[PDB]
């Protein structure tokens, strides 16, 4: 009340400037969402302009642009940012790297594995706007307080449930499942040990589904198959930030054959399968997966 | 200049809906800055009573019907779910001393029904005899504003919506229908699946995008799980007034005659082609 | 349980009229916050809202040369005189409501003395939007709660202080004041009874100055001057509503010769001098006025 | 809308940015609390806590606290802030920012600089819209709080005051105590020697509102010395100096009657100073009369 605990204060304990400009873009997107393809492009412009104006970034990768944006040298800082400004048509997803090579900034500075992330998270636009921010120390949830236009810390050092009771994927594409996913889903509905079957939830928007997985536990799947052999979600600005949040909350995220965060990308827009969530549920999937390998 | 819900309704019932809108705005605010369903129940009850338009009030939260004190008594009976997130409501004219039996009317008797959905924006869908209209809460001025007139649902959709987690307990007809959605026999494209787990959100998506929503009966749950009076009937009335369908499997939800205010009903609703297709599967398999 | 203006009115057609007026005030409040053109915007809002209420037949506004006659299908039994954006920081809305007292509605129905008022009040657009409503039984204050978009009862049966310590007028017109005003003002600064001089306040917007007078006591004057020899403020939709609020709060409102509320108007835009506020202060002014006539 | 021009981005063109960012947070929180209404002690605590957390300040002087606050060494930065957290309790917040001049341990004496040494100064005015006026070496800029996104947005660049206004502003209730020069100056406003139009009078009674009107419409604002108060009534460090700085950067004047407010060398953090400020032609006419006495 008299000691507002804002995201700025929490992070202050260049990166502060970066995240402040991002919060400004998230608040503006939140407002534009509340008063509603056009919104996609305007969200992108907002995030690009705010991140450039922070003096903290040198390379920006967006879902909207084929090539990385290289920041003008007068506005250039040391961070690389990959973002999805309006995921789900909703939310915003971001991942922040430190530039590693010492040469002139280029698309290659964004090709780091998620293990190299300095900070990642997402904003979920709903009745309230929530911002989940993962850093090395752990995961913290902030809520936009619309009265004062600040993100307030509301949940510190978030940890995901060890085991969940919800599974989340688009089962309408069952005809195309690889056998491992088919059997894993069968075990959730027909538990061979006579325990209670899992409930199914699928919002259809990654940020909402992932957020519910974090808060309530369970598993979220956007898996590969013979039709989409690398999955559908984008590694740099969807899978890697979500995998980083999950891992820092004590969860897991795998493509099925390796940790999402260990994939070394060659293309800023490459896709990745992803299965993430409560560690016991992801382990159970990886166990069914290996059986089919 | 400003096309509010009250103006639409005027062109007593207006006083009832005005009081309901006040409760809905208060709940919308409480949801945003979050026992919450107990607060929400009190809100809707207190405003409905203060409207001088109601006599019998049925809520998900109260075991018995609330009878309105005679000073504040009006003509209408209201069944509502204050925090289903969303708010659901159904409004009947009474027809004798007001009592719990006045709420035991088939949904066919509804005068008005609809729901509020609390998201990034707060939407209110209102169905009356002449159709369905959609209102958005403009928080700048605190009024529900007309944004979609005479809403009709698509004839056929591309989404099916149910908790597939319960598949082991499914009725074989539901099992068969869902199988045809994923593995279409006539070589058409499979349906997508969506299931939020919140009935207002799932029904609203069905109204807007088209498709089918199911919370059907099985042998563990022969009457389904949703409540007829303050969940199924209002949603069914909205669906029918938008050119869609709502069936229990055996009959139209709106034609069920309740005997208890908390009784459950199976519900299958949405686009008419899709509900008809389910009914076809339902005929041949139990 | 929420104590709204519409609930208060119902427990005491007038309710639809006041409901429609509240919607216009809420909309004006928002346009003021996010701001000539606003004058006619606000007039349109009030005109359209009152017409759609089905409760009015004759509408008089500052912005319209002649009285508006409501189309027969939307007609009701009430006459409304209003200033939609008085003072156009500090602005407000002023309204007075009469019952039509014959034949076909026309301008003459608006020409009743303020004594005949059924309801009157004002909205003050500040950091909070306040609505003060006067009816037969007294004055009540409502605050707009923006979280829920309703006017909430905040002060019941408001009574003005018997004697205040603030006087309020534009002393820039000192050269044009008649001798009673000059002597009265001089008594406020140099009290012949060794009491403490009054403070002076003058915002220059009638609603703000009158609301301060109501809440803190004192006296407000807008006498005639050389360029405004019949007074400056408009009798029908400025002085009469404020005079009715004052009298219903136990205060007074005079032209000098007689009660504002007893003036019988001849023209819908005619002006009046006005002295209003705490009864001891207005009585002291009247004693000076009588001495000079 | 996609290139939001925030106070932050204007100031970035970074300890001063951090300081001003943290001040903006307190101003937004105060703005909301005023709208939803011990407010001055709450406001004071909010400003102190935000300024402390900024890591940019070392000495804080508040209108509310007898003694200066010395910032703990771990949160210490180079700036000295004098502020009036809720002036008028129409209300506003006033601030003046200095750079510490000294290698000595931070103390009350670091706040005893002439206003000529200010790095930044200004005020927030809470109303229907919340405005922030910021004066820096290069001039005066006005920002409007956009409540949709919780950011101060640049709405008017390089503000200049009118050369001559038509409004004078002071509390004429104190007339019995006026120094003869103020008496004569005010008389000339009402009875102009040259047969020009008399000035209008406005006096809200809140310094931020009265000064802001003076800035926007021109004219003159006076809280002068007299025999009872030889040093005026308003406070030099956190009222007179910030307003004098704003005025001079806008092309106006601000005098005690004997010298520029900004050139007074303070000896006490709470000392008073007379202040006469506003349009240059009007202040010069005041100084003509004051010299005469």
Task: For residue A120, give the nearest of A147, A99, A104, A138 by alpha carbon.
Answer: A138
Out of D129, D175, D191, whose CB is closest to C33? D129
Q: Which two tokens stand for residue A115?
A: 């293990």
Residues of A with CB under 8 A from a CB of D: 1-4, 6, 8-9, 12, 17, 20-21, 24, 27-28, 31-32, 42, 45-46, 49-50, 53, 55, 146-150
Spatial distance between the Cα atoms of C291 and C278, rounded to a whole number of angstroms: 20
C-alpha D53 chain-centroid distance: 23
Q: In chain D, how many H helices and how many E strands?
A: 7, 13
Out of B85, B168, B195, whose CB is closest to A201? B195
Q: What is the side-by-side strand order in the sheet with D131-136?
A: D69-70, D57-62, D76-87, D91-99, D120-126, D131-136, D139-146, D151-156
Contacts of A148 in chain B (CB under 8 A): none
SS3 (DSSP) at B42: helix
Task: For residue D115, give the nearest of D224, D212, D260 by alpha carbon.
Answer: D260
Task: For residue A26, give the nearest of A50, A57, A4 by alpha carbon.
Answer: A50
Spatial distance between the Cα atoms of C188 and C199, rounded to a whole number of angstroms: 8
Contacts of A20 in chain D (CB under 8 A): 8, 21
Per-residue burial over A1-18, b if 16 or more Cβ lie within 10 Å, else e, is ebebebbbbbbbeebbbb
Q: What is the side-by-side strand order in the sheet with B159-161?
A: B192-193, B159-161, B212-215, B267-270, B245-247
Spatial distance between the Cα atoms of C148 and B28, rounded to a whole number of angstroms: 8
Contacts of C24 in chain B (CB under 8 A): 2
Whose structure tokens read 């009745």? A127
Are residues D65 and D86 in contact, defined by beta-carbon separation less than 8 angstroms? Answer: no
Out of B1, B7, B140, whose CB is closest to C45? B1
Task: For residue A219, give the nearest of A227, A207, A210, A228 by alpha carbon.
Answer: A210
Q: What is the side-by-side strand order in the sheet with D200-201?
A: D200-201, D167-169, D220-223, D275-278, D253-255
Q: Do B43 and C149 touch (CB under 8 A)?
A: no
Q: Same domain for D168 and D94?
A: no
Select from C26, C27, C89, C211 the residue whose CB has the most chain D CBs within 10 Å, as the one to mutate to test that interface: C89
Name all chains with 3 or more CB-CB pairs below 8 Å to chain A.
Answer: B, D
Spatial distance between the Cα atoms of D83 and B148, rounded to a whole number of angstroms: 51
Question: What was the resolution (in A) of this experimentally determined structure?
Answer: 2.1
Q: In chain B, how many H helices and how many E strands?
A: 7, 13
Q: Same domain for A268 and A231?
A: yes
Q: Do C172 and D191 touch (CB under 8 A)?
A: no
Spatial distance between the Cα atoms of C200 and C219, rounded to a whole number of angstroms: 10
Cβ neighbours of residue C115 under 8 Å, at least 6 residues apart? Answer: C259, C261, C262
Cβ neighbours of residue B6 under 8 Å, at least 6 residues apart? Answer: B14, B17, B18, B21, C19, C23
Per-residue burial over D213-250, b if 16 or more Cβ lie within 10 Å, else e, is bbbbbbbbbbbbbbeeeeebbbbbbbbbbbbbbbbbbb
Q: Kindly report the number of other CB atoms within 10 A of residue D212's CB atom.
A: 24
Residues of C with CB under 8 A from a CB of D: 29, 32-35, 89-91, 125-129, 146, 166-167, 170-175, 188-190, 197-204
Contacts of A7 in chain D (CB under 8 A): none
Task: For residue D65, give the nearest of D90, D82, D80 by alpha carbon.
Answer: D82
Residues of B with CB under 8 A from a CB of A: 28, 31-34, 85, 118-121, 139, 159-160, 163-168, 181-183, 190-197
D174 is in an annotated binding site: yes
* Domain end residue (candidates: B103, B128, B150): B150
Per-residue burial over B84-109, b if 16 or more Cβ lie within 10 Å, else e, is bbbbbbbbbebeeebeeebbbbbbee
Q: Which phi and psi (to 5°) does residue D26 adopt? A: -65, -40
Spatial distance between the Cα atoms of A75 and A50, rounded to a whole number of angstroms: 11
Spatial distance between the Cα atoms of B248 and B269, rounded to a whole number of angstroms: 9
Residues of B with CB under 8 A from a CB of C: 1-2, 4, 6-7, 10, 15, 18, 22, 25-26, 29, 42-43, 46-47, 50, 52, 139-143
Spatial distance between the Cα atoms of C208 and C224, rounded to a whole number of angstroms: 20
Angstrom distances, CA of residue B162 to CA of A251, B199, B203, B282: 27, 10, 11, 16
Cβ neighbours of residue B40 under 8 Å, at least 6 residues apart? Answer: B23, B27, B30, B82, B83, B87
Residue of B nearest to A91 (CA): B120
* Domain end residue (candidates: C139, C157, C175): C157
Spatial distance between the Cα atoms of B188 and B185, rounded to a whole number of angstroms: 8
Q: Same domain for A162 and A149?
A: no
Name all chains with 3 or more CB-CB pairs below 8 Å to chain D.
Answer: A, C
Following DSSP, what letter does each residue of chain C receive, concatenated?
A: ---BHHHHHHT--HHHHHHHHHHHHHHHHHHHHH--HHHHHHHHHHHHHHHHTT-EEEEEETT-SSPEEPPGGGB-SEEEEEEEEET---EEEEEEEEE----S--GGGG---GGG-SEEEEEEESSSEEEEEEETTEEEEEEEETTTTEEEEEESS----SS-SEEE--GGGGGG--HHHHHHHHHHHS-TTSPPPPEE-B-S-HHHHHHHHHHH--EEEE---SS-BTBSSBIIIIIHHHHHHHHHTT-EEE-SSSBGGG---SSTT-B--EEEE-HHHHHHHHHHHHHT-
Q: Same domain for D131 and D176?
A: no
Q: Which two tokens stand for residue A238?
A: 């969807």
Three-class DSSP labels, chain A: CCCCCEHHHHHHCCHHHHHHHHHHHHHHHHHHHHCCCHHHHHHHHHHHHHHHHCCCEEEEEECCCCCCEECCHHHEEEEEEEEEEEECCCEEEEEEEECCCCCCCCHHHHCCCHHHEEEEEEEEECCCEEEEEEECCEEEEEEEECCCCEEEEEEEEECCCCCCCEEECCHHHHHHCCHHHHHHHHHHHCCCCCCCCCEECECCCHHHHHHHHHHHCCEEEECCCCCCCCCCCEHHHHHHHHHHHHHHCCCEEECCCCEHHHCCCCCCCCECCEEEECHHHHHHHHHHHHHCC
Spatial distance between the Cα atoms of A140 and D158, rounded to a whole number of angstroms: 41
Residue A70: burial class (beta carbons within 10 Å; 0-12, 13-18, 19+): middle
Kindly report the length of chain D.
293
**Which residue range(s) make up the domain with B177?**
151-286
Q: Same domain for B37 and B144?
A: yes
Q: Kindly report the number of other CB atoms within 10 A of residue C226's CB atom.
A: 9
Spatial distance between the Cα atoms of D157 and D142, rounded to a whole number of angstroms: 7
Q: Which two tokens stand for residue D46?
A: 């909010």
Q: Which two tokens stand for residue A252?
A: 């897991």
Q: Which phi and psi (to 5°) does residue C69 adopt? A: -105, 125
Are residues B195 and B164 in contact, defined by beta-carbon separation less than 8 angstroms? Answer: yes
Q: Which two tokens stand for residue A206?
A: 């990654």
Q: Do C173 and D198 touch (CB under 8 A)?
A: yes
Q: Same domain for C68 and C182?
A: no
Spatial distance between the Cα atoms of C123 and D291, rounded to a whole number of angstroms: 46
Spatial distance between the Cα atoms of B24 and A127, rounded to a whole number of angstroms: 13
Q: Same domain for B132 and B164?
A: no
Side-chain-side CA neighbours of A106 within 13 Å: the count stands at 6
Q: Same domain for A7 and A83?
A: yes
Task: For residue A145, give the nearest of C210, D253, D25, C97 by alpha carbon.
Answer: D25
Are residues D54 and D19 in contact, defined by beta-carbon separation less than 8 angstroms? Answer: yes
Cβ neighbours of residue D184 under 8 Å, at least 6 residues apart? Answer: D289, D292, D293
Q: Same domain for D135 and D201?
A: no
Spatial distance between the Cα atoms of C181 and C165, rounded to a whole number of angstroms: 17
Contacts of A126 in chain B (CB under 8 A): 119-120
Name all chains with 3 or more CB-CB pairs below 8 Å to chain B.
Answer: A, C
Spatial distance between the Cα atoms of D246 and A258, rounded to a whole number of angstroms: 62
Select from C172, C197, C201, C216 the residue whose CB has the most chain D CBs within 10 Å, as the one to mutate to test that interface: C172
**Å from D175 to nearest chain A CA?**
41
Kindly report the length of chain C.
293
Contacts of A12 in chain D (CB under 8 A): 18, 53, 55
Q: Do A148 and D12 touch (CB under 8 A)?
A: no
Q: Do C30 and B141 touch (CB under 8 A)?
A: yes
Task: For residue A80, give the nearest of A46, A44, A45, A117 by alpha carbon.
Answer: A117
Spatial distance between the Cα atoms of B229 and B245, rounded to a whole number of angstroms: 17
Spatial distance between the Cα atoms of C287 and C89, rounded to a whole number of angstroms: 35
Q: Same domain for A148 and A172?
A: no
Spatial distance between the Cα atoms of C99 and C268, rounded to a whole number of angstroms: 16
SS3 (DSSP) at B180: helix
Spatial distance between the Cα atoms of D148 and C83, rounded to a whole number of angstroms: 29
Q: Same domain for A141 and A169?
A: no
Out of A9, A20, A147, whose CB is closest to D8? A20
Task: For residue A181, give the nearest of A192, A160, A167, A199 by alpha carbon.
Answer: A167
Spatial distance between the Cα atoms of D139 and D157, rounded to a whole number of angstroms: 8
Residue C267: burial class (beta carbons within 10 Å; 0-12, 13-18, 19+): exposed
Q: Same domain for C182 and C275?
A: yes
B240 is in an annotated binding site: no
Following DSSP, what letter does each residue of D12-67 receive, concatenated?
A: H--HHHHHHHHHHHHHHHHHHHHHH--HHHHHHHHHHHHHHHTT-EEEEEETT-SS
Q: What angle do CA B90, B96, B102 make, to 5 degrees?
A: 25
* Domain end residue (candidates: B97, B126, B150): B150
Q: Which phi and psi (to 5°) does residue D271 adopt? A: -70, 155
Spatial distance between the Cα atoms of C59 and D198, rounded to a whole number of angstroms: 37
Residue D74: burial class (beta carbons within 10 Å; 0-12, 13-18, 19+): exposed
What does the DSSP 8-state code read for residue D89? -
Out of B1, B22, B42, whose CB is closest to C44? B1
The number of domains in chain B is 2
Are residues B109 and B234 in contact, defined by beta-carbon separation less than 8 angstroms? Answer: no
Are residues D125 and D212 in contact, defined by beta-carbon separation less than 8 angstroms? Answer: yes
Spatial distance between the Cα atoms of B82 and B222, rounded to a whole number of angstroms: 26
Q: Angle at which helices A179-189 and A279-291 pack, to 10 degrees?
A: 130
Kindly report the length of chain B.
286
Residues of C with CB under 8 A from a CB of B: 1-2, 4, 6-7, 10, 16, 19, 23-24, 26-27, 29-30, 44-45, 48-49, 52, 54, 144, 146-150
Spatial distance between the Cα atoms of C124 and C143, rounded to a whole number of angstroms: 10
Task: For residue C185, give the nearest of C195, C202, C198 by alpha carbon.
Answer: C198
Are residues C84 and C61 in contact, defined by beta-carbon separation less than 8 angstroms? Answer: yes
Following DSSP, what letter does each residue of C2-29 receive, concatenated?
A: --BHHHHHHT--HHHHHHHHHHHHHHHH
Whose structure tokens read 């006490």? D268
Spatial distance between the Cα atoms of C240 and C113, rounded to a whole number of angstroms: 8
Spatial distance between the Cα atoms of A199 and B164, rounded to a whole number of angstroms: 7
Are residues B89 and B82 in contact, defined by beta-carbon separation less than 8 angstroms? Answer: no
Following DSSP, what letter does each residue of D244-287 receive, concatenated?
A: HHHHHHTT-EEE-SSSBGGG---SSTT-B--EEEE-HHHHHHHH
What does the DSSP 8-state code read for residue D156? E
Cβ neighbours of residue B61 under 8 Å, at least 6 residues apart? Answer: B37, B38, B41, B82
SS3 (DSSP) at B125: strand
SS3 (DSSP) at B108: helix
Spatial distance between the Cα atoms of B161 and B158, rounded to a whole number of angstroms: 10
Task: For residue D83, give the nearest of D118, D131, D129 by alpha carbon.
Answer: D118
Spatial distance between the Cα atoms of B224 and B218, rounded to a whole number of angstroms: 7
Angstrom distances, CA of residue B47 to CA of B139, B230, C117, C152: 20, 17, 30, 14
């Amino acid at each position: 009340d008299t000691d507002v605990n804002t995201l700025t204060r929490f992070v202050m304990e260049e990166l502060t400037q970066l995240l402040n400009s991002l919060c400004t873009a998230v608040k503006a997107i939140s407002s534009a969402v509340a008063k509603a393809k056009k919104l996609d492009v305007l969200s992108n412009d907002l995030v690009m302009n705010m991140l450039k104006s922070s003096f903290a970034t040198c390379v920006l990768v967006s879902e909207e642009d084929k090539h990385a944006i290289i920041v003008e040298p007068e506005k250039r800082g040391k961070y690389v940012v990959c973002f999805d400004p309006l995921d789900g048509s909703v939310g915003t997803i971001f991942g922040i790297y430190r530039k590693k090579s010492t040469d002139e900034p280029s698309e290659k500075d964004a090709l780091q594995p998620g293990r190299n992330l300095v900070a990642a998270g997402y904003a979920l636009y709903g009745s309230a706007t929530m911002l989940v921010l993962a850093m090395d120390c752990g995961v913290n949830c902030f809520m936009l307080d619309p009265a004062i236009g600040e993100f307030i810390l509301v949940d510190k050092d978030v940890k995901i449930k060890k085991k969940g009771k919800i599974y989340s994927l688009n089962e309408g594409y069952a005809r195309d499942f690889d056998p491992a996913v088919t059997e894993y889903i069968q075990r959730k509905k027909f538990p061979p040990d006579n325990s209670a079957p899992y409930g199914a939830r699928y919002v259809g928007s990654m940020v909402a589904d992932v957020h519910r997985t974090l808060v309530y536990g369970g598993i979220f799947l956007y898996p590969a198959n013979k039709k989409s052999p690398n999955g559908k979600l984008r590694l740099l600005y969807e899978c890697n930030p979500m995998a980083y949040v999950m891992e820092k909350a004590g969860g897991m995220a795998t493509t099925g054959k390796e940790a999402v965060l260990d994939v070394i990308p060659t293309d800023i827009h490459q896709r990745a399968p992803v299965i993430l969530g409560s560690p016991d549920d992801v382990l159970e999937f990886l166990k069914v997966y290996e059986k089919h390998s």
